[PDB]
Amino acid sequence: GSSGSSGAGPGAEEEQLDTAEIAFQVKEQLLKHNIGQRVFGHYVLGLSQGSVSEILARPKPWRKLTVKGKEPFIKMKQFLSDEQNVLALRTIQVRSGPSSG
């Protein structure tokens, strides 16, 4: 691999997103700071634990998913557009319950 990229132009489209890559990269970033899928799916996604866990297990084709299928993946790929998103999630993994008073 290794090629390059040169083409500036930020934008606010919905586009096609590699769901298996988002799924992968999320698991990586959670592991990067040892975070759990529930807190990620509860905050970032707004789904149940069991819901995002399926999406992380079985990241069906972007073309297969509905808007209500793409909803999490949009939020996830946006999360992965900036590392501060995971850094802020580390706090929540403390504040998931009584990590002391």
Swiss-Prot record:
<protein>
    <recommendedName>
        <fullName>Homeobox protein cut-like 2</fullName>
    </recommendedName>
</protein>
<comment type="function">
    <text>Transcription factor involved in the control of neuronal proliferation and differentiation in the brain. Regulates dendrite development and branching, dendritic spine formation, and synaptogenesis in cortical layers II-III. Binds to DNA in a sequence-specific manner.</text>
</comment>
<feature type="DNA-binding region" description="CUT 1">
    <location>
        <begin position="8"/>
        <end position="95"/>
    </location>
</feature>
<comment type="similarity">
    <text>Belongs to the CUT homeobox family.</text>
</comment>
